Amino acid sequence: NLLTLERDHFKYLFLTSYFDLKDNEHVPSEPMAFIRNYLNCTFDLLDDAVLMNYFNYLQSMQLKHLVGSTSTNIFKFVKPQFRFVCDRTTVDILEFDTRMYIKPGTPVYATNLFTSNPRKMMAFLYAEFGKVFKNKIFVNINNYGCVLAGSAGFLFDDAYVDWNGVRMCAAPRLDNNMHPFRLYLLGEDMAKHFVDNNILPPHPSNAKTRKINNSMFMLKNFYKGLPLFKSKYTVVNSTKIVTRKPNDIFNEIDKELNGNCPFIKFIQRDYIFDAQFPPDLLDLLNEYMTKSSIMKIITKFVIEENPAMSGEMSREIILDRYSVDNYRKLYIKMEITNQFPVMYDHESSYIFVSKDFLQLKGTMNAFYAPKQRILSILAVNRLFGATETIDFHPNLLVYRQSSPPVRLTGDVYVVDKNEKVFLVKHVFSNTVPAYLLIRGDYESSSDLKSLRDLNPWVQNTLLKLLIPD
């Protein structure tokens, strides 16, 4: 008899197959052994109809970029599995970052095949392309793969790769693979040919000894491989919440941060946009987590001391949209060893909006308040919680008519000698760095300071806010 398994375990199958499993303990024993066999890829031992059924199950729990399918062969030959089309990528200013030219709007597919290593094999693919086309001229052959008028082609590239985003800018690496680089294919006619080809590469890397899998290259079915690790959090208490209105979310947040903890940690699991899911599926996801996922620390605009309001540290309290649309507030025992999505060092926290401060329209990190008629800019931190917005207009900038003997202390940066505009350092609660804009008659201990000598973060904000437009 072939190995066979129940309908229900599709949950485990997708989980393990698609998100780069590491743990295998918590899967039920028999389904786990069956999935082990599957990843061992000795396909003849398992029923085909099982495969077809699971594919239909995915068609039910339908993903966006699924490639259409008709035959089991997809698990037996190199085939496309996802679908894309070239965005604009129409920008001149920065370097192409080794991102080779592509004709805009060209359709594209990703293969099922991955490698540790370019260049050792791709002559094989070149011979395949030789089969594909007879006459050829001026091929843009390269390390990475076939290039010719864009159009038909192929290349090695990483798994998570965006298509036709304008940058590849530096960010820390995290993952490792035995076969990091999936192949990707260009031009529909080659994919059409591959519908026929039903071909598998020669594998002298394994002495061509009929090996199901190869030391330098490997098929995977729809494996995106996004990071995952088991949740282990020392839960104290839980609550689940179901609503759609962010203002209500904000009211809840305020209610919570009237508790003694200075701050709240918030997370946003990424995959929530991807497709339709069983709630039970989401339950299974709840106990494993992806280090790439969005995360923030946010605090109230701290003012002043309630001396009794202290000693809460033991509670660590967090919330996230465990559901695509619903949330899971949690109290946990305070702990070091629990683990969280990796984020860059020195990352600024966020400050929750104030109930009298209005964020400037189309801006960040700057706002105005009426009761004193004052404009303010955070030196570092990032606004949060605004809902309404207000446009700037120069009329707001009432310069003061005060008597000539004005004086000031600390660094002043002149903004305009003509409009008598200036900026001055300030710290709210002796702790929050900020800058105060001002206009009118004012004076200092001389000691003029130059706009050049300032942070880009504030500088860009100011550069728009001047709106010489």
Binding site: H65, F84, D87, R88, T90, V91, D92, I93, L94, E95, F96, R99, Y101, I137, F138, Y160, D162, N164, G165, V166, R167, M168, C169, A170, A171, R173, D175, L226, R244, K245, P246, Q268, D270, F273, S292, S293, I294, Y344, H346, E347, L358, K361, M364, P370, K371, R382, T387, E388, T389, I390, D391, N395, S450, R452, P456, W457, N460, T461, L463, P468
Partner: protein
């Protein structure tokens, strides 16, 4: 255009100068080698830069300015086999060909040649010329460089002109060659042009279409180019409103400085947003007013992307009309009005205040 069979095009920036060596005697089928050789050039002056003695392979060598006849125009040119024939940086359609495949060599791809058999032997130029402008002086022989490459090697500031009658295409050719020869220099020499330039902006647009034409088979070079009026004056105003450590600061410095903030703040600078705004077409594009040309931006190993609309899921369109909507219960007009009156009364201000609710994309 028709591109008749039996022609080949070679692009090479080296073709700014004549590649005497490469040409070989053609022969008709039957090995009917033809030592008669004719070459066509844009101007007689070109003849002043070609040595017969390079070509002992041939007994018969003649040179003429190309001239675009009308009476004998054909999509399918006149045939001849009595001589091998070549054109050198030809500008205008040709109506005659010698025995065997004819070859032609140029730096500039015209639209006439697009649908044609071509090779480029491209290479990456690491260096780029810097545009310069000023309200020491280095007058240069316009249009006629060859007696001056030594000067260009031996200086780093230059100015150039044309005769008033100059054909626009000739201007294009001269400029292209100048830039090509510059790109090999070790020092990005300053250059200026003594022209009203209003049309020259459109000429730069031509250069851009040409660059795309190349890219159809090209090297995806990080070629330097920019809009030079709107962008220019705007950036000048920006520097003026900032501290001006340098009257002559390089344009790219702004972007290079701003590169730091991008990843750590995960958001799009206003500078780059007004870029891709003020271009005629590669922008918000006043030619059509198409702000939906928003940037999508990605970085190494991101699980996300960034745009003018903020964070987005990877490889996705802008936003789903279905949503956890910006439900109108919040941002009801009435509540907006209430808060607006609150603000207006508390401020004691007459007019000029306006407000809007925030909104959200895929992500929130």
């Amino acid at each position: 255009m028709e591109c008749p069979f039996q022609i080949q095009v070679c692009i090479s920036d080296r073709f700014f100068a004549f590649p005497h060596n490469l040409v070989e005697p053609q022969s008709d089928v039957g090995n009917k080698l033809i030592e008669n050789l004719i070459v066509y050039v844009p101007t007689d002056d070109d003849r002043l830069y070609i040595d017969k003695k390079q070509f002992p392979k041939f007994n018969s060598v003649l040179v003429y300015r190309h001239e675009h006849d009308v009476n004998i125009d054909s999509r399918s040119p006149k045939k001849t086999a009595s001589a091998t024939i070549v054109y050198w940086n030809p500008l205008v359609p040709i109506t005659e060909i010698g025995a065997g495949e004819t070859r032609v060599f140029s730096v500039l791809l015209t639209n006439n040649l697009f649908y044609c058999n071509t090779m480029i032997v491209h290479h990456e130029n690491p260096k780029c010329p810097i545009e310069f402008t000023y309200p020491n002086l280095r007058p240069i022989a316009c249009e006629i460089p060859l007696s001056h490459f030594k000067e260009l090697v031996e200086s780093n500031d230059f100015l150039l002109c044309f005769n008033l009658e100059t054909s626009t295409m000739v201007k294009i050719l001269s400029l292209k060659r100048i830039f090509c020869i510059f790109q090999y220099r070790k020092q990005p020499a300053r250059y200026v042009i003594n022209l009203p330039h209003e049309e020259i902006d459109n000429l730069y647009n031509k250069l851009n279409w040409e660059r795309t034409r190349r890219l159809m088979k090209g090297d995806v070079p990080s070629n330097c180019a920019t809009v030079n009026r709107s962008s220019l004056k705007y950036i000048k105003q920006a520097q003026s409103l900032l501290g001006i450590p340098d009257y002559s600061q390089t344009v790219v410095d702004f972007v290079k400085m701003f590169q730091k903030i991008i990843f750590p703040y995960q958001l799009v600078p206003n500078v780059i947003i007004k870029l891709n705004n003020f271009d005629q077409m590669v922008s918000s594009a006043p030619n059509k007013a198409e702000p939906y040309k928003k940037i999508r931006l990605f970085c190494k190993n991101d699980s996300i992307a960034i745009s003018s609309s903020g964070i987005v899921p990877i490889n996705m369109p802008d936003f789903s009309p279905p949503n956890t909507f910006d439900y109108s219960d919040y941002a009801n007009r009435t509540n907006i009005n209430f808060v607006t009156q609150r603000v207006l009364t508390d401020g004691g201000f007459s007019s000029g205040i306006t407000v809007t609710p925030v909104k959200y994309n895929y992500y929130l």
